[PDB]
């Protein structure tokens, strides 16, 4: 989860993430920068590089520790960017030497007057730190029409959907300004489409600050979206708008689903993700009529056993291997693809798209040799 | 309608660029008084910034027109050092009815290497002009053929009739790739245009080539039929210009079967090229399959028939992209249009599409707007005219033909194996630059 | 020559090219220039929409009037412009179609000007005749018309320090701007042979004074030009303040700039009415000029002179000089050397192109020019 | 000088696993403690040109007292993966704890397995030092000793090429293809040792039989070449400037021919043919270069590793007459070689003298660029994705030429030699003209 913690902490706009570790552990800066820029572009916000600072530890620090270097790096971050918050991330080579980041963090927090949050890397260090030090306490303002939506990335799917309910969306944590994180205690509810991700932070928000958490079926499939929207409306007292939106969307979407079903008839899929997320995708596929068998060498064996037309995955490294077997994968960089009523059609025509791309993957499969020995191929 | 907004080509006399594409050949333009012959030698500049200095540019001389054309020819002959002069005529000589043959014949009887092509602008575009120029060269410079005097026909030499020079923006690299591929399987290639050509010596050797390869849907068919009637040379028509390993292998095997080449050499060359190509494609598969933020699923191709069909074939068969809309803008003759449409109908074993023929950019843009590309923005393969439309659709644009005013083109190619890899680089560097 | 680009570069207007498709080839050149001018000026960038009547064999013996009317109707329906211009090349001029009648008829029908160009400047004449307002109610005392071809925003800042506003025309000007020129307080032409007819007509037919003063080239030239503008528009205090401030700011830097240019032999072959200003600016910088002006003629002149760099304003000249190893000042923006900052800009540009000699000298060594030796042994 | 590095310009030594995976059919086996996100490198290469690990990269790479854990990993990888050679790289934790990697890997070597191990403690250097460590480990533990009678007589006209760092120099595949093509043109047998054109471990086994080692880089490979000189007695030719364009490429080819005693007629024929092609294209380009109305950048800044930094500076100064505005080398070369690099920059041309700085922190680099005076035009930046925002701030063009090139999809592009120079010109001046695109 260290990569996810670093990505979340560095994706908070107006904040600076300090990587207390050798230069090697900062290699993720390029990955995080690419994800950050693409998320900004998708969200429509101005695009720019993120500024992650590494303490750049060397042998001297591995021996005698790097507290002085950490303090120097935090001062550098403050002077260069004057952020609204500073996070600190610690790697294995720095965990082994057992540097005490808490003391310097508290001291510099007192000196600068902004949060200095040492990330300790069901639970998430970045979310815990945001709640501890950034989320406003006993707010004097309550936003009855504000809802916290906990997501990693993806386009504005909840924006328009909840707009039809007259509700505003507060996207956290990624791409959120420090102002947005602070005001999450003012929102009228916290909706998390991802049970695994959003459960901890939303539960803590409700318990400590009184912002209700919406616990309902995920917005996947017609029934799931119906229940989800109705729960949102009940919590935020917008039943009339929710019913109007549901009727409109049912009328608009139900026809096209027939043509989509005809086009997707006979297609066999495959899903391999967290049971929570996989459940929604499998529900949407069942709506479209696609067949699902159920839920990196073991992946090779699984794909050989099943031989699906397409796969749905959410972890890196799985797709390239499936590509070499001739199986396209649904690109879930935007996890919001299948959310809501329009999500059904989006996923349907995305499946139709990746079925066309099968031509590339079949060529690759024909003209490549995998690095696995033949004998190992005869094992499960 | 008749109106053409944002022209997709130029007049026949714009085929002077075909003449200037032959090394050490200088066209002499006669458009009337001759105000804006510069409208062409500068039009190629606003294609991929290539310039005609290799055989033309400001170097090009330009103009009763018989007396004045004769004065121009006399002046150019004594100043410019060229292996061959091509005299092209425009509107005014055609309408007035100037006898250009009488003006240019006397020099030819004198032994000067000069030809004239009657290429009235209002007759057609620069594709018809290109065919006129090639036929004029064949008739007036190559001349008749005698195997004893000139040399025995070589069954494994090929004349390549292909992309239109200076209008197909990447013609130099593309012809280099075509020549490299054809020489790989053991042919002697008369590429006839661009840096790889030997010049007028190659054109003099046209009669003693084994066959003519028309590597385009329709351009060059006229020339190949003319050469068949004149020298009795057989013709191989290969309407799809190959991009990528699949189509390139098919094309090479087809040419080897036609010319009776050694199959072992052909297969060895194909195997080596495929090894390289598929190593690079294996490297590319990670991006193609994993890219988080999605890639275009549909595409539209707007351009001349040659590159239009080549790109459609490559995008459908190599990438599995969905053909959204294909419009051919070079105005091919009505006789060949059904064959082109047939090529589009069988674009893949399980994919069938269609091609339209429009020459007015307003109609093309309205057709693109009226088209449904799904919930993702498409990728446009067009020209500078489509940049605004591409921005409007929130999609990517790749400039693949005239006018490519935002490409600086030196040696780029999009054909064969190496050109296919370059094309993939261009396409997917453009797509990922959405957040750049 | 410039009529078609000028007419097509007016925003909110549509230019109709009544001619075969071939004569529309310039649409690409005009589109590139138009987009680059929009980008330089900071305005939104877009393609220009030029419509060709696309005359064919049939129209060469019958006439293109029906096709011309169809094309004008198409322009109106597609774009709904504020003005429509019409061009006419040789092929359509020889057949002698009557564009005036159709122009007047469709002008009456649509209610917007339909301006047939007689390709003095046809586009400027048409704009004055049919677009420029007559007896305007307003009189913008702080508005000055600046005539330029493409240029850049140099007069903007310069006249801003005088409190005046700039109305750039004709290119990149909306039809609203062309109609405003009857209201301006003065008209300034960057070059004589390029900006004298239209301003003179403006002053004669409308009360807008024309500024007659030395061009803003060199210290003395800019002083006189700014003082004339100030006197005409009654901004003498601000003009003198700006002149003194700019003299103080620029005069020191010119000393350092002069040393770097020691021994540099230039060469100018632009219009004699603008080459004069460029030579004045060069003489300010200490550069030596020893030349003043067809590929062969230019080649002979360059061989005779052998300058370190050349200044030109026409195409074809630069690439030929490049093959001889001589850089050319990229005079795509005539406003490079205008004003006090223009002196430093031209000095820096000269120093830049001097560095670029590396490329041209490398090219000169590896290219065969297309001129035969026997002629190359003669003038 | 502060310790902080913002927006890293490189990765740790263990990131040299990409050098091992750049040899065909060679699979690195990484060992970085519990390996939280050791996958970082497997993915940083993906965000530097979208290259993909190829055969032995990506998820194919196995990863983890670590002695027992490393032994289990090696056994599993040996039983599963089919490779000509396995390279075991170790990171921080094995180094700090003090794991005896030799005791774990040597048992397999004595059993005939083609496996080597390199100690690449991440806190001891960047991936350039790791690259040198990996190459030396391969030479020592796989190539082994040389006996001319057993292995084959040394070939005076065979050359080992030590050059661009794989997967960090974004265009290394096409660049090595061009280098090999140039060297084979003048009649050499080339051991390129990396990338698609390499023959794999067979090429590495033939290292002792090469006539000489060509270190085609300012400093990277000098350590390896000295090691090979000590081991096999092979002479070394150091050619610090990697050639781009006809002038530098001709100089480089003539220098190599003089060193190796190659036939001069063949060398001159190859050079004249390549120059014919190159200068035909440059003649076509001269129209744009001299005529372009809207002006082209006059000054440039180059930020990147020493190899490409010096190559680009040389090409931009000598082929084009661009004025060097600011050159910063970011690969952190050893202090010993820095004066020689600076000297190369001082004589960048007969009449042009410039200088190079050495910075590894992107904040310092950006502040230096901002503090630099580029004249009345916006410069052109040759840098990385980190410089995109700065390039926009300066209202100038940026060309991504090194890690991280996150906005380039690189398959076979090259910027070296004769053809790469034309490709580079296309890239540069398609970027400049796209201001109004
Ligand atoms: S369609 Fe005709 S051949 Fe073509 S470019 Fe036009 S005239 Fe020429 Fe010539 S001289 Fe000028 S350009 S208006 Fe006459
Ligand atoms: S400098 Fe060191 S060798 Fe380099 S990448 Fe960092 S650990 Fe590894 Fe590894 S598991 Fe994660 S990444 S904090 Fe430990």
């Amino acid at each position: 989860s260290e990569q996810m913690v670093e990505c979340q902490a560095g994706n908070v706009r107006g904040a600076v993430l300090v990587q207390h570790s050798p230069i090697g552990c900062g290699a993720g800066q390029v990955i995080y920068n690419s994800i950050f820029r693409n998320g900004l572009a998708i969200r429509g916000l101005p695009v720019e590089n993120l500024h992650l600072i590494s303490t750049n530890l060397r042998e001297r620090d591995m021996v005698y520790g790097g507290l002085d270097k950490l303090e120097r790096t935090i001062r550098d971050a403050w002077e260069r960017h004057h952020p609204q918050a500073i996070f600190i991330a610690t790697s294995c080579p720095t965990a082994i030497i057992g540097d005490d980041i808490e003391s310097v963090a508290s001291q510099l927090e007192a000196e600068f007057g902004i949060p200095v949050i040492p990330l300790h890397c069901g639970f998430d260090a970045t979310q815990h730190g945001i709640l501890r030090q950034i989320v406003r306490k006993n707010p004097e303002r309550k936003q009855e029409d504000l809802v916290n939506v906990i997501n990693l990335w993806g386009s504005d799917v909840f924006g328009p959907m909840l707009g039809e309910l007259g509700l505003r969306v507060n996207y956290v944590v990624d791409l959120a300004t420090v102002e947005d994180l602070a005001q999450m205690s003012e929102a009228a509810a916290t909706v998390g489409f991802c049970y695994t991700l959003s459960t901890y932070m939303a539960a803590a928000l409700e318990q400590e600050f009184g912002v209700p958490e919406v616990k309902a079926p995920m917005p996947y499939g017609f029934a799931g979206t119906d229940a989800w929207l109705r729960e949102i409306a009940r919590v935020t007292h917008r039943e009339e708008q929710a019913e109007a939106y549901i009727a409109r969307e049912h009328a608009r979407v139900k026809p096209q689903l027939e043509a989509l079903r005809e086009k997707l008839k006979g297609i066999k899929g495959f899903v391999s993700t967290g049971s929570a997320y996989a459940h929604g995708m499998i529900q949407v596929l069942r709506e479209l009529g696609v067949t699902v068998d159920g839920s990196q060498f073991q992946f090779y064996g699984l794909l050989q056993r099943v031989k699906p037309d397409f796969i749905i995955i959410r972890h890196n490294g799985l797709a390239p291997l499936a590509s070499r077997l001739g199986i396209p994968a649904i690109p879930l960089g935007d996890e919001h693809i299948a959310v809501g009523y329009q999500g059904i059609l989006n996923l349907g025509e995305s499946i139709l798209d990746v079925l066309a791309h099968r031509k590339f993957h079949e060529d690759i499969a024909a003209h490549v040799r995998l690095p696995y020995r033949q004998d190992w191929l005869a094992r499960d | 309608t008749n109106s053409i907004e944002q022209v997709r080509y130029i007049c026949s006399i714009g085929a002077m660029h075909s003449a200037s594409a032959i090394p050490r050949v200088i066209p002499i333009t006669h458009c009337g008084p001759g105000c804006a012959d510069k409208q062409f030698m500068n039009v190629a500049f606003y294609n991929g910034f290539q310039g005609g200095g290799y055989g033309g540019g400001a170097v090009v001389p330009s103009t009763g027109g018989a007396e004045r054309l004769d004065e121009l020819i006399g002046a150019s002959l004594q100043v410019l050092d060229a292996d061959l002069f091509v005299v092209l005529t425009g509107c005014i000589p055609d309408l007035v009815g100037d006898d250009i043959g009488s003006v240019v014949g006397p020099y030819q009887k004198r032994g000067v290497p000069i030809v004239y092509a009657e290429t009235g602008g209002f007759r057609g575009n620069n594709f018809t002009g290109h065919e006129l120029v090639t036929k004029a060269i064949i008739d007036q410079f190559v001349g008749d053929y005698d195997a004893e005097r000139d040399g025995a026909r070589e069954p494994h030499t090929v004349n390549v009739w292909s992309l239109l020079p200076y209008h197909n923006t990447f013609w130099r690299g593309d012809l280099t790739e075509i020549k490299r591929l054809l020489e790989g399987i053991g042919l002697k290639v008369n590429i006839l245009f661009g840096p790889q050509s030997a010049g007028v010596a190659e054109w003099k050797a046209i009669p003693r080539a084994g066959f003519n390869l028309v590597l385009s849907p329709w351009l060059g068919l006229d020339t190949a039929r003319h050469l068949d009637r004149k020298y009795g040379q057989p013709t191989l028509h290969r309407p799809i210009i190959p991009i990528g390993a699949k189509e390139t292998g098919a094309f090479l095997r087809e040419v080897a079967a036609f010319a009776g080449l050694d199959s072992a050499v052909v297969e060895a060359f194909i195997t080596a090229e495929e090894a390289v190509y598929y190593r690079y494609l294996e490297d590319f598969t990670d991006f193609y399959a994993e890219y988080w933020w999605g890639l275009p699923a549909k595409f539209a191709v707007i351009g001349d028939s040659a590159y239009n069909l080549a790109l459609t074939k490559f995008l459908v068969n190599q990438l599995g992209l969905i053909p959204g809309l294909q419009i051919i803008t070079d105005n091919p003759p009505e006789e060949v249009r059904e064959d082109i449409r047939a090529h589009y109908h069988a674009i893949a074993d399980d994919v069938a599409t269609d091609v339209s023929f429009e020459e007015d950019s307003y109609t093309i843009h309205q057709k693109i707007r009226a088209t449904d590309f799904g919930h993702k923005a498409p990728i446009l393969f067009g020209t500078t005219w489509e940049r605004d439309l591409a921005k409007e659709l929130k999609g990517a644009i790749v400039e693949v033909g005239f006018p490519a005013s935002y490409e600086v083109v030196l040696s780029r190619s999009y054909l064969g194996y190496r050109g296919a890899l370059t094309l993939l680089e261009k396409i997917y560097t453009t797509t990922v630059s959405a957040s750049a």
Side-chain angles (χ1 to χ4, degrees), chain A, chain B:
Chain A
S1 59
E2 287 97 328
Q3 174 263 16
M4 203 47 77
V5 168
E6 265 65 87
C7 208
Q8 288 220 308
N11 277 41
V12 178
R13 283 184 291 155
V16 163
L17 175 64
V18 167
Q19 295 161 304
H20 187 33
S21 53
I23 202 66
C25 307
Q29 288 184 20
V30 311
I31 307 171
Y32 307 151
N33 185 69
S34 212
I35 292 158
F36 179 74
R37 286 181 72 98
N38 274 289
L40 288 176
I42 286 159
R43 201 70 69 73
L45 312 156
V47 185
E48 68 204 295
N49 296 305
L50 43 59
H51 302 274
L52 311 206
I53 327 206
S54 202
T55 59
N56 182 34
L57 304 194
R58 309 296 305 262
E59 295 89 322
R60 221 273 164 290
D61 321 290
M62 310 296 77
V63 192
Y64 284 27
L67 256 288
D68 45 279
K69 280 204 185 186
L70 174 55
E71 198 256 353
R72 178 65 269 171
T73 303
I74 296 159
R75 289 192 179 287
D76 279 336
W78 167 254
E79 288 169 9
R80 300 160 171 207
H81 313 289
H82 290 290
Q84 277 97 83
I86 291 167
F87 308 86
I88 304 167
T90 278
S91 74
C92 290
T94 36
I96 291 299
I97 54 198
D99 276 6
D100 163 49
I101 295 65
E102 305 285 341
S103 58
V104 152
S106 33
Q107 153 188 307
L108 293 173
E109 172 164 17
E111 186 172 326
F112 300 134
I114 51 149
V116 176
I117 305 149
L119 310 178
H120 289 277
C121 54
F123 183 86
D124 192 299
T126 312
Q127 294 164 351
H128 177 44
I130 286 156
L131 292 158
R132 279 201 343 271
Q133 272 142 286
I134 287 160
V135 169
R136 233 172 302 163
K137 208 105 73 179
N138 298 322
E140 303 96 333
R141 184 172 146 65
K142 272 286 191 184
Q143 314 201 46
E144 170 251 8
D145 66 324
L146 190 79
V147 170
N148 296 313
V149 179
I150 294 153
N151 66 7
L152 302 179
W153 319 283
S155 34
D156 220 7
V157 68
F158 295 103
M161 173 156 38
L162 296 176
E164 294 263 88
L165 269 65
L167 291 170
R168 276 185 303 123
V169 165
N170 195 40
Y171 280 120
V172 298
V173 163
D174 311 76
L175 312 193
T177 61
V178 178
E179 286 70 14
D180 304 1
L181 300 168
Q183 90 191 349
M184 303 185 347
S185 59
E186 315 184 351
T190 305
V191 307
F193 65 125
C194 180
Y195 257 41
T196 48
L197 168 73
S198 68
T199 184
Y200 165 81
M201 153 150 267
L205 260 163
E206 173 172 277
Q207 144 178 100
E208 278 141 300
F209 306 79
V211 186
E213 175 196 24
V214 181
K215 309 169 273 291
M218 272 160 317
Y220 289 109
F222 273 118
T225 315
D226 270 18
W228 189 80
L229 281 168
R230 288 194 179 108
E231 188 75 341
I232 297 330
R234 186 195 61 70
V235 168
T236 76
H237 326 304
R238 272 141 165 87
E239 286 87 341
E240 328 95 343
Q241 303 88 21
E243 295 307 331
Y245 175 74
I246 286 169
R248 258 173 289 154
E249 290 305 300
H250 274 216
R252 184 187 63 80
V253 170
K254 286 176 109 70
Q256 308 164 85
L257 201 52
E258 178 43 69
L260 253 186
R261 281 171 177 158
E262 291 324 287
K263 298 216 218 72
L264 288 157
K265 190 150 28 43
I267 298 297
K268 160 147 69 95
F270 174 90
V271 186
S272 57
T273 322
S275 184
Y277 184 77
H279 188 72
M281 212 72 19
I282 288 163
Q283 189 43 58
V284 180
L285 293 174
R286 144 161 56 270
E287 298 258 9
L288 295 151
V290 168
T291 298
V292 180
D293 89 320
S295 180
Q296 92 301 26
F297 29 64
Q298 70 286 308
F299 204 53
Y300 180 125
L302 239 172
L303 292 175
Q304 301 269 246
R305 277 153 20 61
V306 186
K307 273 168 247 301
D309 290 336
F310 71 101
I311 54 156
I312 308 193
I313 38 63
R314 278 223 292 103
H315 289 9
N316 296 324
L318 287 54
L321 190 270
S323 178
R324 286 161 174 80
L325 307 170
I327 299 139
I330 298 279
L332 277 180
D334 174 320
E335 58 202 4
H336 294 332
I337 182 57
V339 164
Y341 300 113
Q342 187 62 30
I344 301 164
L345 312 182
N346 276 354
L347 185 63
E349 78 101 46
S350 287
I351 289 155
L352 287 173
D353 288 340
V354 310
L355 285 186
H357 305 163
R358 214 151 37 173
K359 281 191 163 55
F360 174 87
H361 307 280
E362 286 166 355
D363 212 40
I364 293 304
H367 289 89
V368 305
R369 71 145 299 101
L370 286 139
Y372 305 102
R373 302 153 62 71
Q374 77 301 324
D375 44 284
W376 166 263
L377 312 185
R379 301 172 61 200
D380 200 4
Chain B
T1 184
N2 64 287
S3 320
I4 283 172
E5 190 176 311
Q6 295 177 330
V7 300
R8 324 291 301 206
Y9 50 68
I10 62 188
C11 47
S12 322
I13 212 182
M16 62 151 248
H17 293 131
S18 305
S20 90
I22 309 162
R24 293 177 51 74
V25 171
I26 295 178
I28 304 161
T29 290
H30 182 34
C31 186
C35 92
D37 69 315
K38 310 259 278 292
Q39 249 180 338
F40 311 135
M41 38 219 99
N42 233 29
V43 105
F45 183 77
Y46 291 97
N47 230 348
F49 292 107
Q50 42 197 274
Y54 190 14
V59 180
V60 172
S62 180
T63 306
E67 167 249 346
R68 165 177 29 191
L69 173 61
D70 204 15
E71 283 167 0
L72 182 43
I73 291 166
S76 312
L77 256 49
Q78 66 141 357
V79 169
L80 302 168
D81 177 39
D83 290 350
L84 175 75
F85 294 99
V86 186
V87 176
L88 298 101
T89 78
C91 317
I92 311 310
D94 184 6
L95 302 173
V96 169
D98 296 346
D99 191 9
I100 307 314
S102 74
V103 180
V104 177
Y107 293 94
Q108 297 179 331
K109 286 121 176 151
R110 256 172 263 157
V112 180
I114 185 162
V115 312
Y116 65 95
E118 269 192 273
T119 186
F122 56 87
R123 296 256 134 80
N125 58 3
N126 50 328
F127 295 77
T128 63
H130 169 86
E131 300 264 50
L132 287 174
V133 167
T134 60
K135 276 164 128 220
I137 293 170
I138 281 151
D139 275 321
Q140 294 163 37
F141 176 71
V142 186
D144 279 320
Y145 176 55
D146 198 43
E148 319 68 68
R149 167 185 82 222
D150 304 300
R153 181 155 297 159
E154 302 150 29
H156 292 172
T157 303
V158 61
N159 308 306
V160 176
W161 309 98
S162 207
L163 305 170
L164 175 67
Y166 282 109
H167 184 96
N168 286 112
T169 311
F170 325 97
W171 65 283
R172 279 168 297 166
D174 285 348
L175 290 190
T176 293
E177 180 69 354
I178 286 155
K179 195 194 167 114
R180 189 188 74 80
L181 294 177
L182 287 177
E183 296 186 314
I185 59 171
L187 283 163
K188 199 189 161 310
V189 177
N190 298 331
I191 201 72
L192 299 164
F193 296 107
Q196 297 294 130
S197 174
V200 307
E202 247 180 19
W203 282 75
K204 281 247 65 162
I206 275 164
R208 51 177 227 269
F211 60 109
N212 293 294
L213 167 69
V214 181
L215 190 57
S216 52
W218 71 276
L219 186 74
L221 283 176
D222 216 67
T223 302
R225 283 194 299 268
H226 177 71
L227 291 175
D228 203 337
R229 291 190 300 262
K230 201 181 172 84
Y231 307 129
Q233 271 176 318
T235 294
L236 170 58
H237 186 207
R238 220 292 181 160
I240 294 159
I241 309 188
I243 309 175
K246 204 192 322 320
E247 200 55 33
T248 310
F251 156 80
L252 290 172
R253 294 194 181 92
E254 165 163 19
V255 172
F258 185 86
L261 295 170
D262 176 22
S263 25
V265 169
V266 175
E267 294 304 336
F269 181 76
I270 289 165
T271 301
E273 294 302 303
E274 271 181 352
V276 171
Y277 176 90
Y278 283 114
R279 228 128 48 198
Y280 279 119
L281 258 213
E282 211 212 334
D283 293 335
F284 180 71
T285 198
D286 306 69
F287 165 83
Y288 195 71
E290 172 101 358
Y291 193 57
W292 288 12
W293 319 105
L295 303 157
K298 302 226 198 337
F299 62 86
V301 186
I302 307 99
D304 58 285
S305 50
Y307 245 71
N308 193 295
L309 181 54
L311 283 168
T312 312
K313 195 86 178 162
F314 180 71
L315 297 166
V316 169
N317 282 276
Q318 183 61 84
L319 298 168
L321 296 189
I322 297 146
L325 174 73
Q326 294 80 43
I327 298 150
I328 282 170
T329 70
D330 58 345
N331 202 359
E334 284 288 348
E335 317 96 52
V336 311
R337 293 190 180 198
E338 287 307 304
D339 308 289
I340 300 163
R341 290 185 76 222
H343 287 305
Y344 280 82
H345 293 151
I347 200 80
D349 265 347
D350 59 315
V351 188
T353 183
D354 221 333
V355 65
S356 339
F357 303 93
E358 312 293 346
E359 303 79 34
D360 167 56
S361 309
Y362 177 80
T363 308
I364 291 153
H365 293 164
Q366 290 301 101
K367 202 122 60 156
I368 293 158
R369 288 194 193 94
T371 297
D372 186 28
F373 292 105
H375 93 260
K376 267 139 93 189
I379 177 151
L380 304 190
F381 293 81
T383 80
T384 299
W385 299 131
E386 279 76 56
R387 287 208 151 271
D388 287 354
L389 183 54
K391 260 159 271 143
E392 171 181 334
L393 296 181
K394 282 99 73 154
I397 171 151
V398 181
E399 284 175 358
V400 290
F402 170 91
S405 297
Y406 286 97
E407 303 293 320
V408 175
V409 176
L410 281 93
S411 67
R412 195 183 322 167
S413 177
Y414 293 148
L415 303 189
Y417 305 89
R418 305 181 181 174
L421 301 182
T422 303
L423 173 65
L424 289 176
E425 288 181 311
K426 165 57 62 156
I427 290 161
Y428 289 104
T429 304
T430 308
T431 61
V432 301
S433 96
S435 67

